[PDB]
Design a protein around this nucleic acid. Structure first.
Lengths: 133, 60, 178, 142, 261
RNA sequence: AACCAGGACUUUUACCUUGAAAAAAUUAGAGUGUUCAAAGCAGGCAAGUUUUGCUC
RNA sequence: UUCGAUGGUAGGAUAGAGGCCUACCAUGGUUUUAACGGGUAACGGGGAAUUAGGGUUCGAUUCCGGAGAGGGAGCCUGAGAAACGGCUACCACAUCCAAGGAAGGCAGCAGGCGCGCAAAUUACCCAAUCCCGACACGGGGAGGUAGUGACAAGAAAUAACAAUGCAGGGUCUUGUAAUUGGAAUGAGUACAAUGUAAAUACCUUAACGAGGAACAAUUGGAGGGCAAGUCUGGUGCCAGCAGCCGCGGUAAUUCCAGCUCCAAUAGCGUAUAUUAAAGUUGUUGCAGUUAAAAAGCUCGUAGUUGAACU
């Protein structure tokens, strides 16, 4: 990591979602590997933003090093980022907790048994206890 | 189509051929190396000339 | 998904596989160009045959036909850009005269050999796998890359590696240890 | 000779269709002999149950014992003959071994000097051939 | 079969949508609306594969449900809304207006008209007849109904709307020396002038059209859309203006632009 | 009347040319450097400011 | 042609046309240009294989249309179903059973038995495509992601750098090297950064990472077709090969063992169905005196072909 440069193409400002999108390519011929946080900081330093409303994905390297291509998004009014960016990107960047949900197969089975059980269920269980105790 | 046969005589020779041993050999590269090797010795290193026979399986 | 992914066979075997004249011809061609096997010969022959078939179909039509002129210009321009067709005699009749050697002379193997830095033809084959050759700004490793019109002056060495330096190591470090 | 009129397509087509049955290849392909009369049903391979072993005599100018086997097909129960490629393996191939049969090459014709043989053993008892002759793989317990 | 279909297929979608063969097995399947499913551009396609304001179905749904995109002066919250020929998609957030017109090759391209010239729309009337109480009414190509039209308006005439106050503003007859843009067939998107009209009883009618660069062709009546008079097109035509340059013309032009540009 | 021009003019065709109309995928094939290729329908600028964009 | 087959009249039913049905009236309708019946080892098409042209074979299968949910039949809801992950009745299966009874349909996604020559996980996810809904948020075995396979396709790794007496050739240059040293080392082992819903894989990438078991590349053939043995041991018209010819009765180039070479190469071989061969299905483009085939002769209808001239 000696000298890496960033270049943006296909720049476009989207006022419908309050964001600005670009295609980011980074040149790093000197045997340098790049994370995502540092590129987020570089995009934060540019465009005089807070560096907290920058979301980048892609960032796939070419053969034998050289140039790496990816997509970058910046957001004004960072509440726009929170309300528009998908949850998986939010939990990837660390701005949203990972919601603890049970497996999909378990949810399917619980829905099936809940459907088979008519009504609420507590009253049915009490009646079953009355008959079986 | 004939009702005739000696089931005992089947496999007569196989049971009487003596079994010999095999001499260990160093590894010879195969594939592209063998193709390249035969190309290198295909026109130059020849002893079967004078006649044009080009016998790659000599007999004596 | 909804639509199939198109695929095709790029090599065709000959009808007679044990004729001496052809067998010696491929033997000489493989030795000259450092071909691993006959698959490269089949692919080059099939590509040349398809080019010949298109040329024959175009030459069947009369002169100044809009379809013939458009397609004939397209194949000639593609061939000269790839360098297979000579800068002169672009008249849709010498494309048939083009042979396998013309296709093979634009291969990455021969081109680097004529440019030097090879010392052999099989040396190039053992050299491309080490990613020592870059074509412009891309380090190509396939022997059949085929160099374009402007890549002749851009066939360069790799910045890294023992030839380029940059701490080669590996076997060198093994020797340096003891 | 043949009609050469601009409206003789019906005559040419009818004559071609009628005479097309003369060819043995077309007759076989359209009469379904590979399924009805054939021991198989167009299958390339099949399984059978061994019945016995026959040393069929060789026709002129030869005379030999070819240690062939009489087999019963699993899917149909019909009795046919089979040939053993490897030498001296008669003791290895026993009866009721759940053998696997395939064709020979002439698509339903006898091979060489032995009449009545059209099928050969590819696998026996699930161990296959080319292994019990070199002792690479031995037969399983039954 | 056994009921209407609700799933379309990628490959089964119209070719002019320009959808990738891979990356998805299903197509937008436009919902019922003003335009036919085979002659319409879905709003999701327009806002994703044409304008690229959105990248995913969630993104385009959020854009549409924010009540920002308006079609013909009215906000549309439908994802696969069938926006077809001559529709004014007004993005009031940024302040841009688009008029859906066919490209030089017939595909639905992107055209940008100003704030003015976006408050009107030309409709080819489909049938004119008198309805209840004897009152007259006409129906147009986009499934619009207009009551009390001018008596001069007949079948195959192009009328001008407002999209905020309705009512007819101007009307153009169908005859010789009228600017027409083809909206179907092998010449869809080409602009020219009516020259000759044929007549067939019980079948389609042939209209001969000559473009600005002196090229004459023929097309069916159902593919002819009147867009203005001679020397005055009542809409802003896109680049190309319906001239239909051939493959050789496109090739030498592309070579001319390439290099330094 | 006909003399000029305009709308229809096949009695009825086969035949030939051309046009309209008519799924996509497929095939041939245009363009484009998935490092070549089977591919895909993407893409390109610019190596001195890393360019609040432009161009197929 | 009854118990509707052809047409007419009238009526009923259908959302609507209609012999769809009903009553009456006439005997009509198709057919050697093949009606009708039968077989189909027949879902149809875009299309696929072979490739001078013409042709031949296939299409169960990523798209479109049709039928079906063990077999028929009937019906409610609903705009839309004769729906079967809706119901009713019968038949053939299988099913708990206090023997009174309830009752069910994987040709949906995984998985199981059996028939089989023949075909995979009882995995993850709604992130991408789109669909449904009261709906910016829910669901989707649609779909996407992964896991096992010998094969359907595309790219290349098994190496090369020297000394080496000699065959030499020409002081320039290959060869086996019972030999070694330094070189270029890539798969793997393992924390990183990308990738991804999260992972696998991919590109970059902490570092370790070959000297002969290196980290041993095989399948068929060597009489011809069709390429490569009168080389050596064992049997000896036997064992056996052998697609065909053909070899095997002591000198076996074809039998089985060693060696070498040949074609292909992570592929080779075998079996079957098809295509080219096949100008042996011939329209292009066969043949009929003697090899297969001019009817014993004549008349002559469909059919084919039809002198010249406007």
């Amino acid at each position: 990591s000696e000298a890496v440069t960033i270049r943006t193409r296909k720049f476009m400002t989207n006022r419908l979602l309050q964001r600005k999108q670009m295609v980011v390519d980074i040149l790093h011929p000197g045997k340098a590997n790049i994370s995502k946080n540092d590129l987020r900081e570089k995009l934060g330093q540019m465009y005089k933003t807070d560096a907290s409303a920058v979301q980048a994905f892609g960032l796939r390297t070419h053969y034998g090093g050289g140039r790496t291509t990816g997509f970058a998004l910046i957001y004004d009014d960072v509440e726009a980022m929170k309300k528009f960016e998908p949850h998986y990107r939010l939990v990837r960047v660390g701005h949203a907790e990972p919601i603890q949900k049970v497996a999909r197969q378990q949810r399917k089975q619980r829905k099936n048994r809940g459907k088979k059980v008519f009504g609420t269920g507590k009253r049915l269980a009490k009646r079953k206890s009355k008959q079986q105790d | 189509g004939k009702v005739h046969g000696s089931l005992a005589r089947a496999g007569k020779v196989k049971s009487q051929t003596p079994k010999v041993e095999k001499q260990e050999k160093p590894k010879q590269p195969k594939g592209r190396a063998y193709k390249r090797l035969l190309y290198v010795r295909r026109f130059v290193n020849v002893t079967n000339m004078v006649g044009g026979k080009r016998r790659m399986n000599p007999s004596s | 998904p909804s639509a199939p992914r198109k695929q095709s066979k790029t090599y065709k075997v000959p009808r007679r596989p044990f004729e001496s004249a052809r067998l010696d011809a491929e033997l000489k061609l493989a030795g000259e160009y450092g071909l691993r096997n006959k698959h490269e010969i089949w692919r080059v022959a099939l590509t040349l045959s398809k080019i010949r078939r298109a040329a024959r179909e175009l030459l069947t039509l009369d002169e100044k036909d809009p379809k013939r002129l458009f397609e004939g210009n397209a194949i000639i321009r593609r061939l000269v850009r790839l360098g297979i067709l000579d800068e002169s005699r672009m008249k849709l009749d010498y494309v048939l005269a083009l042979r396998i050697e013309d296709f093979l002379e634009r291969r990455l193997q021969t081109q680097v050999f004529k440019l030097g830095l090879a010392k052999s033809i099989h040396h190039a084959r053992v050299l491309i796998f080490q990613r020592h050759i870059r074509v412009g700004k891309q380090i190509v490793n396939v022997p059949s890359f085929v160099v374009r019109l402007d890549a002749q002056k851009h066939i360069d060495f790799a910045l890294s590696s023992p030839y380029g330096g940059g701490r080669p190591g590996r076997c060198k470090r093994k020797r340096l240890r003891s | 000779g043949k009609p050469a009129g601009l409206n003789a397509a019906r005559k040419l087509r009818n004559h071609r269709r009628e005479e097309r049955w003369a060819d043995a290849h077309y007759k076989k392909r359209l009469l379904g002999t590979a399924y009805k009369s054939s021991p198989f049903g167009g299958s390339s391979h099949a399984k059978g149950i061994v019945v016995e072993k026959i040393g069929v005599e060789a026709k002129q100018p030869n005379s030999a014992i070819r240690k062939c086997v009489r087999v019963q097909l699993i899917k149909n129960g019909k009795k046919v003959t089979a040939f053993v490629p490897h030498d001296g393996c008669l003791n290895f191939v026993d009866e009721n071994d759940e053998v696997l049969l395939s064709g020979f090459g002439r698509k339903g014709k006898a091979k060489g000097d032995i009449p009545g043989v059209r099928f050969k053993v590819v696998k026996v008892a699930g161990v296959g051939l080319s292994a019990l002759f070199h002792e690479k793989k031995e037969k399983p317990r039954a | 079969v056994r009921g209407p279909k609700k799933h379309l297929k990628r490959v089964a979608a119209p070719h002019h949508w320009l959808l990738d063969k891979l990356s998805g097995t299903y197509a937008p399947k436009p919902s019922p609306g003003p335009h036919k499913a085979r002659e319409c551009l879905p709003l999701i396609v327009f806002l994703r594969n044409r304008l690229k304001y959105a990248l995913n179905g969630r993104e385009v749904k959020a854009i549409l449900m924010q009540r920002l995109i308006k079609v013909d002066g009215k906000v549309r919250t439908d994802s696969t809304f069938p926006t077809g020929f001559m529709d004014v998609i007004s993005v009031d957030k940024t302040g841009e207006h688009f008029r859906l017109v066919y490209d030089i090759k017939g595909r639905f391209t992107v055209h940008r008209i100003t704030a003015e010239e976006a408050k009107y729309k030309l409709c080819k009337v489909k049938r004119v007849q008198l309805g209840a109480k004897g009152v007259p009414f006409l129906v147009t190509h986009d499934g619009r109904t207009i009551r009390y039209p001018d008596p001069l308006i007949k079948v195959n005439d192009t009328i001008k709307l407002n999209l905020e106050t309705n009512k007819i503003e101007s009307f153009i007859k169908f005859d010789t020396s009228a600017q027409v843009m083809v909206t179907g067939g092998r010449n869809m998107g080409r602009v020219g002038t009516i020259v000759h009209r044929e007549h067939h009883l019980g079948s389609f009618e042939i209209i001969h059209v000559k473009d600005a660069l002196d090229r004459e062709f023929a097309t069916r009546l159902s593919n002819v859309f009147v867009i203005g008079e001679t020397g005055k097109s009542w809409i802003s035509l896109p680049k190309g203006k319906g001239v239909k340059l051939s493959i050789t013309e496109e090739r030498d032009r592309r070579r001319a632009l390439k290099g330094l540009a």
